[PDB]
């Protein structure tokens, strides 16, 4: 519930 999936560096 705590974090979003993303590629490193995404702004």
């Amino acid at each position, epitope marked *: *519930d*705590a*974090e*979003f*999936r*993303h*590629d490193s560096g*995404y*702004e």
Partner: antibody, heavy 118, light 109 residues
């Protein structure tokens, strides 16, 4: 389990506005959150997101560098500071709770209307 | 960016008919991260289906979701009057979070 937004209204282009979303009925600090908007008559557009701790924020290209998402976990409140507002930022803004990484949005606010016009 | 293309843009259907709504992704999306929402005028979106196939609590069995990879489907087996609304798919598999542009299901009379 509820999310209640406020802070919407009319602002001139180039202006600033802060939206709030008050969370109740759940442990606010446990959940990643997001803002989503919907221009009148148009589709849903993701705006910004933040992890449960507030340590990492995320922005859509349309709003990067103009909007700042923040939270105050001790106040069960999510914020969206909108700066350098443009006519195309006009929309109903919703806060949404992430649910699981976050897999979907399960709870939504009622929405608050922001109009950007001279 | 993962573009979600919903088709058709609009459906005109009679009560009791099957509604088949498509959401095509521009690249593969883990099915755990693909959800469907219903929205009626003046209201916030309501979660219908999460993880491609799981019904949210309170959602009737006539709603079902399926699919994987780049092709996802929401099926309403037999349309009730309260099912006429706009339907959006959503992916939270990768940033930026994206929605499909919606399919509006209208009542044929």
């Amino acid at each position: 389990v509820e999310l209640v937004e406020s802070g919407g209204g009319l602002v001139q282009p180039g202006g600033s506005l802060r939206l709030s979303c008050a969370a109740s009925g759940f442990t606010f600090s446990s959940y990643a959150m997001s803002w989503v908007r919907q221009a009148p008559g148009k589709g849903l557009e993701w705006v910004s997101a933040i992890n449960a701790s507030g340590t990492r924020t995320y922005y859509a290209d349309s709003v990067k560098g103009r909007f700042t998402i923040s939270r105050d976990n001790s106040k069960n409140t999510l914020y969206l500071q909108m700066n350098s507002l443009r006519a195309e930022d006009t929309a109903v803004y919703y806060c949404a709770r992430g649910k699981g990484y976050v897999r979907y949005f399960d709870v939504w606010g009622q929405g608050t209307l922001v109009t950007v016009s001279s | 960016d993962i573009v979600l293309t919903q088709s058709p843009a609009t459906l005109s259907l009679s009560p009791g008919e099957r509604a088949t709504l498509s959401c095509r992704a521009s690249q593969s999306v883990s099915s755990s991260y693909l959800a469907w929402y219903q929205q009626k005028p003046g209201q916030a979106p309501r979660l219908l289906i999460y993880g491609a196939s799981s019904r949210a609590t309170g959602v009737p069995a006539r709603f079902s979701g399926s699919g994987s990879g780049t092709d996802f489907t929401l099926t309403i087996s037999s349309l009730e009057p309260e099912d006429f609304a706009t339907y959006y798919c959503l992916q939270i598999y990768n940033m930026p979070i994206t929605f499909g542009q919606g399919t509006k299901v209208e009542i044929k009379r």
